[PDB]
Write a protein that binds this ligand. Structure first.
Ligand code: CLA
Ligand code: CLA
Ligand code: CLA
Ligand code: CLA
Ligand code: CLA
Ligand code: CLA
Ligand code: CLA
Ligand code: CLA
Ligand SMILES: CC1=C(/C=C/C(C)=C/C=C/C(C)=C\C=C\C=C(C)\C=C\C=C(C)\C=C\C2=C(C)CCCC2(C)C)C(C)(C)CCC1
Ligand SMILES: CC1=C(C/C=C(\C)CCC[C@H](C)CCC[C@H](C)CCCC(C)C)C(=O)c2ccccc2C1=O
Ligand code: SF4
Ligand code: SF4
Ligand code: SF4
Lengths: 706, 139, 29, 128, 80, 161, 30, 107
């Protein structure tokens, strides 16, 4: 009968330690707050969003303030090809003389980090040149974070609290965001490219002190109204042009060169601007157009579960398109920085997609009404529900037996001294597509390997001018634009498919079995996350919808891991110009053990040793740190509540019976973590361990050999 | 009535019994009349000895009183085990049998509380009780 | 950078420093 | 739990005659001898084993760490005051440790006794 | 405390009552025939939620269901 | 030359693997007595390797830059011998045991101890389903066209909604 | 001279108070 | 323990394909497999899977041959028992080949 926790009234009467844990676990779980109403819920969400908004801005301000103060951007802009970007200083009192001596690196005198987020390459392209331009963004974001905070506070006050109808006006939000949020922002970013970014890449300084005076083009805005848009197709930059300075600089602000800049190996600024200007137009027009709509509007989980499903899709795209299409100068050449950005965003994509299906299952338990959803599209998947899972179950089984089978087949015959007996399947359907995209390496000789096809010529309106720049790049093996593939790429791609199929099955089944099955017809009555249904009826562990999300988090990490494992190993050879090592060893699993894990861990594992230490001791310590916390998760997942609760009782007895200690007492009675709690806590250790093992290895292995 | 005091068995032990939960709130007392001087397993450790009695044992949980008398039913046929809950440092005296007869035997005059006039296949979805203080299985 | 611009940054950080103290109280309220 | 070192006269002398079980002392003074005892040896580890030991300066910094744990332990002795004694709720015994009744000076009797120990014990090893 | 509901599909077998380790349940006369009996829950404050009860019901889709709720000293099974 | 692959007759690194394996066996053979049972095991291990290389040299296979033969499947009938006829060879025998279990269980489940003859499987009906398994691609066409390869969804156990 | 004070305030001094405030908020009642 | 011992001595079993010591390289690989194959049973529970067979027995009731032996999950003690018996199946056999290959060569 204590005041804490406020949001959960029932928890507040629990006299044990469970109260504190669950009071944290049910705090921001607003849908089960005591005495809550729908109108208060929506107004609270809006304000909560501002807090997140402020944090992202502060984070980027923290990404700005520390670089301007302790980084080396001004030093970096001068010759990016050898300077290591500095994240921030190292102020750790436990450091010794020899640890300061090792991390005083990147040409610094005090210890600092070597940054790998790529913000230096991104900010350069955007037009930032000096540390003081950095200092402006952090200060500006500080106000914007406080302005979002004030606004969140503002829209919670009586006179400014919105009504319910405003929050549920779905069509207007899409219209206003593709109008505003998408339309106006993309068009303006083309403007920031042409009014700021492009001049600075051509040696011309444009700042607040002069931006109103210097125009982006010699005689612009007289052709603009008269329809003579073609004047902006004036003289681009020559192949001899040196990025960031005026030796070879042109005057174009809108182009369609295609390919990559020969020096930077990244997109043309003028090319990025036209793309954003064009997409902007598309969203502004579509944003002026406005039974399932009555269902997607009343469930906050359905909207979010699609919003993560949209976020999860485009997060994967960001990883796929940034490694093959580098958009920032020299970002293709900073290989560790190429490695961190791909892995990071791919893991995020896995969480959102898994999360999308997780919140979908919550919708099915608390909001899906069988009688307001009848004879529509939603309830017709529930109709043949047993069919979808059963077929999906088969494909996973099918994929697994054969994909593992081919790898083991190759391994054995290779183990016996006979590599020629391996089963190596050429990715001919894939090799078709690159050849259809213009890659004349595989020689399939149709569709822009065909020099006369109507696609390459485009006899309609003489449009196709991305083609020269593109064809040069697709045949040169100096980038990652449609990388060469062989037997290794075939097997992994089917493994990834196997990973995508097994991960999707559990998440779809979890949502589809959330409301009920034969083993548990009334599952919906117990809510989303509950322990089980006892040892009766054969046993019911891991029967809750939450547990399905929980098991799937193990499968996604494996899937997203295999993708990042594949992407990493392949890139090692290309960056070291010896693609042959990977091509022959990646078709059997011992190669991934000998030439990928063991081989690339040589330096990382020697970050410190009995003879000294180097600048990789953190990564070496973190690697071991990750292994420990990964393994710590196994403890909570294998040993369950009962064992611990009985163990705790002997400690409670011992404390109360020990003089000089008996005198003091706990306020909350000690109890073991809950059944669901342990799964989450175990998985959290496991997953953090999964990443911080991979983060330590990925960064350290590449930073030592380049 | 508990008639305290009553003779405790000849036991002498149990680190596994009756620490500082009891003296602040809610401990227990089973009573029976053992028709021998046999040895029996306690829930704390196991052996005390049953008396002729007026037997009495001060336990810690209502769970612990029940599994004692189920052994008194199975291994010793002592049907007279009468569990309690103590005065001021406990709550409600004489919980079992609350109606004078055994709860596996049916007694009229008891109240059908929790009795539900529907099936569980006829259970509503929480969308018909959403944002409402009604509970999905209530009646 | 300089030494003085660092403290002007730390002086304008109190403008987020009072509203989050108010908004989290307001999100609690 | 009745045999033999919970029941012996050798322990029931020593248990009762310590200033957490002694009857005559006061909460400023029975938090003092408790404070004087634990604080005195707490300089022991740091002056022998610290971050730096082979220095001047190993006894100064070792004793400076020693009062560092004490000022956290005034807070822990007051957060057992601010949590277990919230509204000064009594109990069935109401000694110094059951209910509070002396706790506001007991947190400082440790502070006088604990930091008064390291101020005492600094001049034994470093000095004299 | 935990919630223990008894539905009208009970076949008066009395197994559930004798399965409960803390004596939370008892049989009461059914009025639809005055010959059947149904279980009743006068001591829900002692239910630990072990679910031993639900395992004893023979009927194809149980008549007594235990939905775990707010935890208390009794329901968490603490000796302390 | 389906993806730049050169044939194994004119693959130069593929014929290099044959000069690399027996030389490792020749180092294993120079040290021994050349009439010992190691050496009759050392003349065999050359020649069992040899006719494998003279199987893939002669098959018109497409070896890669590694010197190792790869498999092509888009299925054309120039490269049908990689996947198609070794693949449908699985499919014929898979429906054989597939029409064993489809046909064994419908009769035996109409018995008194219908499940002990899943434990103690009768040697009559099993070897019949060996004979009934050989007609698997033809027999299921009059099953589905009549409808007795499936059921209606009012006959099948289906999880609640 | 800036981080040498600041990091033992945020890492040491700050959790000594914000867990002290979040010790008297978890374990108090109305 | 990882650098000087585990990284140094795991070399002898991953440079062993095409050797007489090569099934040691296979069992080192093969027992890393079955160890992780335990975690499918250890970290998981029953009531997911016995719910999942409702979908898999549907595929044999849609085609009218769902067996008289009802295809069941494992019991909870069994899922523990299989999970530990495959766990010790890996970590001992991982070391069994790893000890064999290393001490044959340099020892
Ligand atoms: C929405 C963002 C945005 C804003 C606020 C501006 C604002 C401006 N532009 Mg810019 N411009 C934009 C988008 C924008 N433009 C885009 C997307 C392009 C590429 C097509 C240009 C290409 C452009 C040229 C070539 C010129 C301007 C010029 C101007 C200035 C004069 C306009 C006027 O008063 O009539 C004004 C500051 C004129 C100027 O003098 O720049 C300072 C000028 O010559 N703009
Ligand atoms: C032998 C009779 C038999 C038949 C005709 C089927 C038929 C089917 N199974 Mg099932 N299944 C069976 C037994 C059978 N099953 C057994 C014994 C197991 C445990 C290993 C399974 C586990 C299983 C899973 C997990 C899945 C299926 C699926 C399927 C469907 C797709 C085909 C497939 O890929 O199978 C799958 C093949 C395997 C899993 C491997 C082979 C199975 C065993 C080892 C065959 C043993 C045959 C036995 C030795 C013969 C006895 C001889 C005697 C009759 C004379 C199809 C309806 C899938 C589905 O749901 O499709 C929609 C699916 O995901 N089955
Ligand atoms: C290397 C160890 C390992 C291996 C070989 C497998 C293999 C498999 N898992 Mg398992 N699994 C594992 C670890 C592993 N898992 C771990 C660590 C977890 C988290 C506890 C799971 C949780 C899990 C779930 C939830 C499911 C699988 C399923 C499967 C099967 C997928 C079908 C196929 O690919 O053929 C396959 C047998 C799927 C399955 O069997 O569906 C029929 C399935 O739904 N696994
Ligand atoms: C059934 C499981 C399955 C799944 C999920 C995938 C998924 C994929 N395949 Mg794979 N593939 C499969 C089976 C599968 N394949 C089979 C059986 C073969 C022949 C051995 C291949 C041969 C193959 C090649 C050569 C390539 C892919 C590629 C891909 C990827 C891109 C899509 C594509 O090109 O599809 C193509 C569509 C199919 C292959 C048809 C779907 C598979 C059907 C359902 C299998 C049925 C088997 C059939 C009954 C066997 C009878 C043989 C007989 C007729 C002769 C994608 C991950 C490409 C890639 O790696 O891109 C990066 C690629 O180049 N696949
Ligand atoms: C299930 C886990 C769990 C959790 C989350 C809690 C939580 C709590 N316990 Mg309980 N308790 C538990 C189980 C648990 N308990 C168990 C198993 C026992 C033994 C039976 C106890 C016995 C117990 C007692 C006697 C007391 C608590 C108290 C507390 C509260 C304060 C935290 C504390 O005093 O830790 C203390 C921390 C430790 C013991 C860790 C050792 C610390 C060492 C010395 C190193 C730290 C020193 C270092 C210099 C750190 C300084 C950092 C600074 C510089 C930033 C907190 C609500 C207190 C309370 O409720 O007040 C009324 C209290 O008096 N607990
Ligand atoms: C758990 C094993 C362990 C041990 C024994 C040590 C020991 C030490 N550490 Mg290390 N360290 C460890 C693990 C350990 N560490 C871990 C897990 C980490 C974090 C990853 C660190 C990170 C670390 C850092 C950064 C530093 C140390 C330092 C030290 C040294 C000084 C610490 C000190 O003065 O405390 C003071 C000691 C006390 C306050 C009390 C000690 C325990 C008392 C004596 C128990 C009394 C019981 C009594 C005997 C029995 C009853 C008595 C009876 C009469 C009633 C000391 C050698 C410092 C150093 O430089 O190393 C040389 C230092 O800077 N440690
Ligand atoms: C928001 C992201 C962010 C992050 C992760 C960091 C991280 C760091 N800062 Mg930096 N800092 C930031 C923003 C950030 N800062 C901003 C916006 C400013 C200008 C006001 C500063 C001004 C600054 C100075 C002067 C110094 C640091 C220092 C440091 C380092 C040591 C910790 C410290 O003393 O912080 C002190 C932090 C401040 C004085 C201001 C922080 C203001 C941000 C917005 C707070 C964000 C809080 C975060 C959301 C809380 C989440 C946890 C909580 C909910 C439990 C550490 C690397 C020290 C250093 O450089 O060591 C090498 C140092 O001397 N920071
Ligand atoms: C993240 C914040 C943080 C910071 C800034 C530090 C900083 C320090 N730790 Mg570390 N430590 C931390 C987290 C942190 N720790 C954590 C999370 C752990 C657990 C893994 C440790 C475990 C650890 C151990 C075991 C030891 C340290 C020690 C030290 C000190 C080494 C240098 C020294 O004492 O010079 C010489 C200077 C002196 C000896 C004078 C000491 C002054 C003391 C600390 C304060 C005196 C009271 C002061 C006037 C008022 C209170 C201030 C105080 C709360 C900071 C340094 C102050 C070592 C140490 O010396 O402990 C005290 C040490 O042995 N740490
Ligand atoms: C041509 C080709 C190819 C392809 C293939 C494919 C694409 C296929 C698919 C397939 C398909 C698309 C088909 C359809 C199907 C569907 C369904 C619907 C199915 C079902 C099935 C069934 C129904 C079965 C039955 C049976 C039998 C037959 C026997 C036993 C028993 C059973 C019942 C199981 C490849 C490249 C590889 C190679 C080359 C050539
Ligand atoms: C996957 C999984 C299952 C499902 C797996 C099962 C039921 C085992 C099925 C595989 C076995 C090996 C099938 C037996 C194969 C037949 C006997 C084949 C006969 C063919 C003859 C030729 C021998 C559980 O039942 C389970 C229970 C509790 C915790 C975790 C889990 C768990 O993770
Ligand atoms: S404790 Fe675990 S295994 Fe036992 S019934 Fe509950 S969920 Fe199942
Ligand atoms: S357990 Fe169920 S079936 Fe048995 S008597 Fe009680 S209500 Fe009836
Ligand atoms: S929930 Fe547990 S304690 Fe309560 S009646 Fe059922 S079996 Fe007995």
């Amino acid at each position: 009968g204590t005041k804490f926790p406020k949001a959960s009234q029932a928890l507040a009467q629990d006299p044990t330690t469970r109260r504190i844990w669950y009071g944290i676990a049910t705090a921001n779980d607003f849908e089960t707050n005591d005495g809550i109403t729908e109108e208060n819920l929506y107004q609270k969400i809006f304000a909560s969003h501002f807090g997140h908004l402020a944090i992202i801005f502060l984070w980027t301000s923290g990404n700005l303030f520390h670089v301007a103060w302790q980084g080396n951007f001004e030093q970096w802009v001068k010759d990016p090809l050898n300077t290591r970007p500095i994240a921030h200083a190292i102020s750790d009192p436990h450091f010794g003389q020899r640890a300061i001596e090792a991390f005083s690196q990147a040409g610094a005198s005090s210890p600092v980090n070597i940054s790998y987020s790529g913000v230096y390459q991104w900010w350069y392209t955007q037009g930032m040149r000096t540390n003081e331009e950095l200092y402006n963004g952090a200060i500006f974001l500080l106000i914007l974070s406080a302005l979002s905070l004030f606004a969140g506070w503002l829209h919670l006050q009586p006179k400014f609290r919105p009504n319910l109808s405003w929050f549920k006006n779905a069509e207007s939000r899409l219209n206003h965001h593709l109008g505003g949020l998408f339309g106006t922002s993309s068009l303006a970013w083309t403007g920031h490219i042409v009014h700021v970014a492009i001049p600075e890449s051509r040696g011309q300084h444009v700042g607040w002190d002069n931006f109103l005076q210097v125009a982006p083009h010699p005689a612009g805005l007289q052709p603009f109204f008269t329809g003579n848009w073609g004047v902006y197709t004036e003289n681009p930059d020559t192949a001899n042009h040196v990025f960031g300075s005026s030796d070879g600089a042109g005057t174009a602000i809108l182009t369609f060169l295609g390919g990559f800049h020969p020096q930077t190996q990244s997109l043309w600024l003028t090319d990025i601007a036209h793309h954003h200007l064009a997409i902007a137009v598309l969203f502004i027009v579509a944003g002026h157009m406005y039974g399932l709509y009555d269902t997607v509007n009343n469930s906050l989980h359905f909207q979010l579960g699609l919003a993560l499903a949209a976020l999860g899709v485009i997060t994967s795209l960001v990883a796929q398109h940034m490694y093959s299409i580098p958009p920032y100068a020299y970002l293709a050449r900073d290989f560790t920085t190429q490695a961190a950005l791909y892995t990071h965003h791919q893991y995020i994509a896995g969480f959102l997609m898994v999360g999308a299906f997780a919140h979908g299952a919550i919708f099915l338990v608390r909001d899906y009404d069988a009688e307001q959803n009848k004879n529509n599209v939603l309830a017709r998947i529930i109709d043949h529900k047993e069919a979808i899972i059963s077929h999906l179950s088969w494909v996973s089984l099918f994929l697994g037996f054969h994909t593992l089978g081919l790898y083991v087949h190759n391994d054995v015959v290779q183990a016996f001294g006979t590599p020629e007996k391996q089963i190596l399947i050429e990715p001919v359907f894939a090799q078709w597509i690159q050849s259809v995209h213009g890659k004349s390496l595989y020689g399939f000789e149709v569709l822009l390997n065909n020099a006369d096809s109507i696609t390459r010529v485009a006899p309609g309106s003489a449009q196709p001018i991305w083609l020269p720049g593109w064809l040069d790049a697709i045949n040169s093996g100096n980038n990652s634009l449609f990388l060469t593939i062989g037997p290794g790429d075939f097997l992994v791609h089917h493994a990834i498919a196997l990973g995508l199929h097994t991960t999707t099955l559990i998440l779809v089944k979890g949502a589809l079995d959330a409301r009920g099955s034969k083993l548990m017809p009334d599952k919906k009555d117990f809510g989303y996350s509950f322990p089980c249904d006892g040892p009766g009826r054969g046993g019911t562990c891991d029967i809750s919808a939450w547990d399905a999300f929980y098991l799937a988090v193990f499968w996604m990490l494996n899937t997203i891991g295999w993708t990042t494992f594949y992407w990493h190993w392949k890139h090692l050879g290309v960056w070291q110009g010896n693609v042959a090592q990977f091509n022959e060893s990646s078709t059997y699993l011992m190669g991934w053990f000998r030439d990928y894990l063991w081989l690339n861990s040589s330096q990382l594992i020697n970050g410190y040793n009995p003879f000294g230490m180097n600048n990789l001791s953190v990564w070496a310590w973190m690697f071991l740190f990750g292994h420990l916390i990964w393994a710590t998760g196994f403890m909570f997942l294998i040993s369950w509540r009962g064992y611990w609760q009985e163990l705790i009782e002997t400690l409670v007895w011992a404390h109360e019976r020990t003089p000089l200690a008996n005198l003091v007492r706990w306020k909350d009675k000690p109890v073991a973590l809950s059944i669901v709690q342990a799964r989450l806590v175990g998985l959290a250790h496991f997953a953090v361990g999964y990443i911080v093992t991979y983060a330590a290895f990925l960064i350290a292995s590449t930073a030592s050999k380049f | 009535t508990l008639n305290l005091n009553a003779p405790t068995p000849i036991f002498g032990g149990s680190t596994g019994g009756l620490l500082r939960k009891a003296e602040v709130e809610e401990f227990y007392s089973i009573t029976w009349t053992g028709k021998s001087e046999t040895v029996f397993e306690l829930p704390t450790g196991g052996a005390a000895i049953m008396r002729a009695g007026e037997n009495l044992l001060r336990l810690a949980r209502k769970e612990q009183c029940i599994a004692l008398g189920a052994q008194l039913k199975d291994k010793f046929k002592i049907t007279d085990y009468k569990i309690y809950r103590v005065y001021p440092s406990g709550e409600v005296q004489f919980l079992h049998p609350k109606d004078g007869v055994f709860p596996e035997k049916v007694n009229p005059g008891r109240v059908a509380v929790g009795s539900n006039k529907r099936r569980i296949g006829q259970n509503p979805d929480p969308a018909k009780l959403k944002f409402k203080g009604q509970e999905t299985f209530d009646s | 950078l300089a030494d003085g611009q660092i403290f002007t940054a730390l002086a304008v950080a109190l403008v987020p420093g009072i509203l989050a103290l108010r908004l989290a109280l307001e999100l609690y309220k | 739990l009745s045999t033999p070192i919970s029941n012996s006269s050798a322990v029931n002398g020593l248990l009762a005659n310590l200033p957490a079980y002694r009857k005559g002392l006061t909460p400023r003074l029975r938090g003092l001898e408790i404070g004087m005892a634990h604080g005195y040896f707490l300089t022991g580890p740091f002056v022998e084993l610290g971050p730096l030991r082979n220095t001047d300066g190993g006894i100064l910094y070792g004793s400076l760490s020693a009062v560092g744990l004490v000022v956290i332990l005034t807070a822990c002795l007051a957060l057992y005051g601010k949590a277990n004694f919230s509204g000064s709720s009594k109990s069935k015994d109401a000694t110094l440790w059951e209910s509070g009744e002396g706790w506001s000076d007991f947190v400082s009797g440790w502070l006088i006794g604990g930091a008064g120990s390291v101020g005492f014990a600094y001049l034994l090893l470093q000095y004299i | 405390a935990h919630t223990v509901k008894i539905y009208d599909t009970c076949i008066g077998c009395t197994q559930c009552v004798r399965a409960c380790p803390t004596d939370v349940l008892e049989m009461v006369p059914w009025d639809g025939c005055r010959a059947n009996q149904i279980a009743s829950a006068p001591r829900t404050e002692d239910c630990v939620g072990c679910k031993r009860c639900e395992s004893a019901c023979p009927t194809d889709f149980l008549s007594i269901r235990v939905y775990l709720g707010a935890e208390t000293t009794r329901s968490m099974g603490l000796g302390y | 030359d389906v993806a730049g692959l050169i044939p194994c007759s004119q693959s130069d690194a593929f014929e290099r693997r044959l000069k690399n394996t027996t030389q490792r066996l020749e180092n294993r053979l120079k040290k021994y007595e050349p009439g010992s049972a190691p050496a009759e095991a050392l003349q065999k291990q050359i020649d069992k390797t040899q006719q494998r290389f003279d199987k893939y040299r002669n098959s018109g296979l497409l070896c890669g830059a590694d010197g190792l033969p790869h498999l092509i499947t888009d299925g054309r009938w120039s490269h049908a011998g990689e996947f198609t006829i070794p693949g449908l060879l699985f499919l014929y025998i898979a429906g054989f045991i597939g029409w064993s279990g489809r046909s064994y269980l419908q009769a035996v489940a109409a018995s008194d101890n219908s499940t002990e003859k899943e434990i103690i499987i009768d040697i009559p009906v099993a070897l019949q389903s060996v004979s009934k398994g050989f007609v698997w691609p033809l027999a299921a066409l009059q099953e589905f066209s009549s409808g007795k390869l499936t059921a209606r969804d009012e006959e099948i156990t289906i999880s609640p909604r | 001279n800036l981080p040498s004070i600041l990091v033992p305030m945020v890492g040491i001094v700050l959790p000594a108070i914000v867990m002290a405030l979040l010790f008297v908020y978890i374990e108090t009642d109305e | 323990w990882l650098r000087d011992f585990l990284w140094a001595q795991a070399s002898q079993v991953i440079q062993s394909y095409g050797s007489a010591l090569s099934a040691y390289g296979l069992m080192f690989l093969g027992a890393h497999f079955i160890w992780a194959f335990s975690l499918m049973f250890l970290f998981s529970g029953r009531g997911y899977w016995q719910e999942l067979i409702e979908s898999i027995v549907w595929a044999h009731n849609k085609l009218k041959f769902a067996p008289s032996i009802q295809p069941r999950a494992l019991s909870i003690t069994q899922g523990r028992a299989v999970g530990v018996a495959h766990y010790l199946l890996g970590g001992i056999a991982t070391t069994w080949s790893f000890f064999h290959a290393r001490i044959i060569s340099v020892g």
